Amino acid sequence: SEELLDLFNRQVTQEFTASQVYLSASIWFDQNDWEGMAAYMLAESAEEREHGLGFVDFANKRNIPIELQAVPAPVSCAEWSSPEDVWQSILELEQANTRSLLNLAEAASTCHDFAVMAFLNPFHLQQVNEEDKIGSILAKVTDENRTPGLLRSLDVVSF
Amino acid sequence: SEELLDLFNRQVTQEFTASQVYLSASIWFDQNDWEGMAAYMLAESAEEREHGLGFVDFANKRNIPIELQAVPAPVSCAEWSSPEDVWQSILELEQANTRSLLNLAEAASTCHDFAVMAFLNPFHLQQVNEEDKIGSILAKVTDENRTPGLLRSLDVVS
Amino acid sequence: EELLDLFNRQVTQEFTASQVYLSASIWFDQNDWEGMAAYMLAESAEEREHGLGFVDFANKRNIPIELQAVPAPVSCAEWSSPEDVWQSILELEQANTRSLLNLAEAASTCHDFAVMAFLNPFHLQQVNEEDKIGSILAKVTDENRTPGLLRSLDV
Amino acid sequence: SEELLDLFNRQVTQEFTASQVYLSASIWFDQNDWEGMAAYMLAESAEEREHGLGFVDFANKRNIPIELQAVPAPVSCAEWSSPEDVWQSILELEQANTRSLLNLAEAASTCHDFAVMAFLNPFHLQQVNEEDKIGSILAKVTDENRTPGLLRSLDVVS
Amino acid sequence: SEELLDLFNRQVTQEFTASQVYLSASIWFDQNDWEGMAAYMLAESAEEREHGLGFVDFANKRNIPIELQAVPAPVSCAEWSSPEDVWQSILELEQANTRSLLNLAEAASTCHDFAVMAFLNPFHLQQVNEEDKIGSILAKVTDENRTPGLLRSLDVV
Amino acid sequence: SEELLDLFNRQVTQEFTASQVYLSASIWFDQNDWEGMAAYMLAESAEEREHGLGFVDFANKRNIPIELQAVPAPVSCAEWSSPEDVWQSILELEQANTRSLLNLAEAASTCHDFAVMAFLNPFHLQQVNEEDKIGSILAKVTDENRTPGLLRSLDVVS
Ligand SMILES: [Zn+2]
Ligand SMILES: [Zn+2]
Ligand SMILES: [Zn+2]
Ligand SMILES: [Zn+2]
Ligand SMILES: [Zn+2]
Ligand SMILES: [Zn+2]
Ligand SMILES: [Zn+2]
Ligand SMILES: [Zn+2]
Ligand SMILES: [Zn+2]
Ligand SMILES: [Zn+2]
Ligand SMILES: [Zn+2]
Ligand SMILES: [Zn+2]
Ligand SMILES: [Zn+2]
Ligand SMILES: [Zn+2]
Ligand SMILES: [Zn+2]
Ligand SMILES: [Zn+2]
Ligand SMILES: [Zn+2]
Ligand SMILES: [Zn+2]
Ligand SMILES: [Zn+2]
Ligand SMILES: [Zn+2]
Ligand SMILES: [Zn+2]
C-alpha cells in the first residue's frame, strides 16, 4: 500500500535531515568555541545517518522502493545566538523524529504490517532515551547559563 | 577572496552530494541483487561523507564560515538500467569532484593561500587514485558484461 | 637575496616566539596559574623545535644561517590578567603565520619548490595553533566574567 | 677468455633488457586495467634485475671486467593489442634469455671454466621453471580469451 | 601540454639512468676493493629504480602515457681513478636530477597541474637530503684522502 | 636583596647565551660536514637551555623576579676556521659560565642565602664535569688535527 511506502521514504529523509541539523549544531558550537558540545553534535549527526541507512537497508530487504529526496539546508543556525537556542532546536528536532516514527508505526498497524512494527520497536525505545537525554542536557544548560562563564566551565568538563 | 570562501563552501556541498549519489548507487545495486557492488558503493558513500566533514573541520579552524546547503535529490538512478550505467555515472561523479577540487586550488593559488593549498594536496592525490580505481572497475564491468551472467560471477568474487 | 634573508629571519622569529611563550609561563607561574604556566612552557619548547627545524633544513640546502640576537619579550610588563597574556600569545601566533606566508611567497616567486614543500606542514600547523589559542582565549574571556571562576579551570 | 668475457658482459645486458621488457609489459597491462597481470610482470622485472646483479657480482669476484651497456628501449609493446600478445612476447623473451645462458655455458665448457659452469647451473634450472610457468599462463590466457570477458574474470582471480 | 607529458616520461628515464650510474659506481668500487662504498652505491641504485617505478605508477594512474626509453650506458666510469672522482660524479648526477625534478614541477605549475605538484613534493625534499648526504661524504673523502691509506678507514664503514 | 636577585636574573641570560653559542657551533660543524661534532653541540645547546629553565623555575618558586633579557647574537662563529677554534671557544664559554655560577654562589654566601647555595651545588659539580669533558675533546682534536684527514676519521667514530 502506498501510504506506508510514502511514510517509509519520508522517514529516510527525516533521519538524514536530522543528521544535517546535528552537523549544523556542531559547526555553530565549533565556531563559537564549545568544542565538547560540538563533538557531541558531530557524533549524533553520524548516528542519525546510521538510522537513515538502517531504514534504507530494511526497505531494500522488504521490497519497499526508496527514492532518495533532497536533504534541505538547516536554517536555525542563522538565528542561534547561545548554546541554549541550539539545544532547544535539537530537542524540537528529536520530538519531530519521534512523531514521524509514531506516524510510520500507526500506518503499519493499520496495514497489519507486523514486520515493520517489529522493525520499529527499537527505534521507539531509542527516541525515548534520546528525548530524555536532550531534555536533561537542556535543563543543565539553562541552569548553568544563569551565571556568566559557568556554562563554559562545564563544556570543558562534561562532553 | 569571497570567491575562495564560496568555493570552499561549495566543496562541502559537492562531497555531501557525492555521498548521496553513492548511496543511490548502493540502493540501485541492492534492488537488483548486486550485493557486492552495493557494499562497495555504501563504503564510498561514508568515505565521501568523511571528506566533507574534513573540509568542514578545516574551514572551522581557519574561520572560513560554512553554511550547509541542501543536498539535492540524486537523479541518475531514474535512468540506470545496468551495472555499467551506474559505474559510468560514478566515474563522471568523481571526475566532477576532481574538477571542483582543482578549481578550489586555483582560487587558493591566486590568493596565495598556502595553507589551503597544503590542505588540498592529499585530496588531489586521493582523486587520482579514485578515478583510476573506478576506471579500472568500469573496464572490467564493460568487458565481463559481454557474456550473459558472467558479470554476476564477479560481484560474488567481491 | 630576499629568500635567504627571510629564511634566516624565520629562525629568529621562531626563537623570539619561544622566549615570548617562556615569558607568558613566568607571568602565569608568578601569579599562580600552574596549568597555564605548564602549557606556555611546552609551547616555548615547541617554538624552539620549529626554529631548529628551519636551521636543519637551511644547513641541508646550503642556505647560510647566521644566528641573530633573540630579542627580549616586551609584553609581560603590561599583562594584568590571563586574558592579556592569551591575547598577546594569539597576536604572536598571527605574526608568525604572516611571516611563514611571506616566506612561502618569496619561495613561490623564486620557483623554490623544495622550500614550498618544506613549509607546508608549518602552514597547517599554524592554522591548528591559531584555532587552539582562539578557542582558549574565548573560554578565558567568558569565565573571567565571574570572580574566581577562571581559577576553577586552570586547576 | 676473450669470447667468455664478452659473453659474460652481454648476459648482464640481456638480464637488464629482460627487466625492462617485463616493465613494458606491466605498463601495458596496467594501462588496460589488467592489475593482476601487471603486478606479475612488475615482480618479474625486479627478479630479472636481480639476475643481472648476480652476474655482475660474480664477474666482480672472478675479475671479469664488466662495462655496463645501454639497456635498449622495449619495442614489442608497440604491437600488443591483447593480453595474449604480451604473454607471447614474454615467452619469446625467456626463450632468448635461455639461449643466451646456454651459449654462455658453451663458451665456459670450451674454456674448461668449471667455476663459471657451476655458477650458471641454478640459472639453467630456473630458466626451465620460468619457460614452463609462462607456457602454462599463455595456454590459460589463450583458452580463456575465447569467451568475451572470461579472461577478465581471471586477472581478478589469479 | 606536450611539454608536461614529455617531461614526465623523461623523468622516468632520468631515474633509471641514475640507477645505472650508481650501479656503475658500485662496480668501480668493488673492482678497486672499496666494499663499503660499493654496497652504499648498490643500495642507492635500487632506490633510484624505486623512484623511477614511482613515476611510472603515478603516470599509469593519471593516464600520462609512458613509453620506456633506452637507459644509456654510464659514461663517467671510464675515467674514474680514485674514490673522490666517483663521489664527485655522483654529486653531479644528483644535482642534475634535482634540476630535472624542478623543471618538471615548473611545467606542472604553468599548467596548474596540482596533482603532479603534490606528487612531486616528497621527491623535492628527498633530493635536498640526498645532495646534502653526498656533499658531506665527498667532503670527508676529499679530507681523508690527503693521507695515504687513511681513506680505507671510511670504507670499513 | 638587590645584587643577588640581579645576578640570579642574569644567570638565566648566561645559560641561554651559552645555548645559542652551542647552537652556533653546531651550525658551523654542520656547514663544514662534521655531523658528529654538530650533533654533540646541538645536544649541549638543549642542555644549556634546560639549565636556564631550572634557574627560572627556582626563581619563580623563591619569588626572585625574572625579567628575560635579549639573548646576544653568537659572534665567535665569524672567526672559526677549524674544529679546534670552535672547541676552544666552547671551552672558554664553559669556563665563563663556571665563573658566573661561582660569583652567584659568593653573593648568596654573603647573604646567608642557604637555599640558593644548596640549589647551586649540583651546577658547580656539573661545571667541573663539563670543563673536563671539553678539555679532553679539545686535546684529542688538537692532537689528531696534526695529520691531514685524521680528525675526520674520528668525528665518524666518536
Ligand atoms: Zn574546531
Ligand atoms: Zn543519540
Ligand atoms: Zn534517528
Ligand atoms: Zn535522533
Ligand atoms: Zn540487501
Ligand atoms: Zn574511495
Ligand atoms: Zn570526496
Ligand atoms: Zn570521491
Ligand atoms: Zn611554580
Ligand atoms: Zn613556530
Ligand atoms: Zn607557534
Ligand atoms: Zn594501476
Ligand atoms: Zn620468475
Ligand atoms: Zn633472467
Ligand atoms: Zn627470466
Ligand atoms: Zn665484491
Ligand atoms: Zn631519484
Ligand atoms: Zn637520487
Ligand atoms: Zn647536516
Ligand atoms: Zn649551563
Ligand atoms: Zn654548560
Author numbering:
A (entry chain B): 1 to 159
B (entry chain F), D (entry chain E), F (entry chain H): 1 to 158
C (entry chain C): 2 to 156
E (entry chain A): 1 to 157
List passages from the publication reporting this PDB structure:
A novel ferritin was recently found in Pseudo-nitzschia multiseries (PmFTN), a marine pennate diatom that plays a major role in global primary production and carbon sequestration into the deep ocean. Ferritin is a 24-mer that forms a hollow sphere, takes up soluble ferrous iron, oxidizes it at di-iron ferroxidase centers, and stores the iron oxide mineral in its central cavity. The structures confirm the typical ferritin arrangement: 24 subunits assemble to form a hollow spherical shell.
Zn (1 h)refers to the structure of PmFTN from crystals soaked in Zn(II) for 1 h. Zinc ions are competitive inhibitors of ferritin and bacterioferritin. Crystal structures of Zn(II)-inhibited ferritin confirm that this metal binds to the ferroxidase site and site C. The zinc ions are coordinated by the same residues as seen in the structures from aerobically iron-soaked crystals. Glu-130 is predominately coordinated to the zinc ion in site C, although in three of the monomers of the asymmetric unit, Glu-130 adopts two equal occupancy conformations, one that coordinates to the zinc ion in site B, and the other that coordinates to the zinc ion in site C. Furthermore, the zinc ion at site A is modeled as coordinated by two water molecules, one of which is bridging to site B. This arrangement of coordinated solvent is similar to that observed in the iron-soaked structures. Zn(II) bound to sites A, B, and C in contrast to the two sites observed in EcFtnA. Furthermore, overall Zn(II) occupancy of the three metal sites resembles iron bound in the presence of dioxygen in PmFTN rather than mimicking Fe(II) binding. Thus, the use of Zn(II) and likely other metal ions as analogs of Fe(II)/Fe(III) may not identify the correct binding sites in other ferritins.
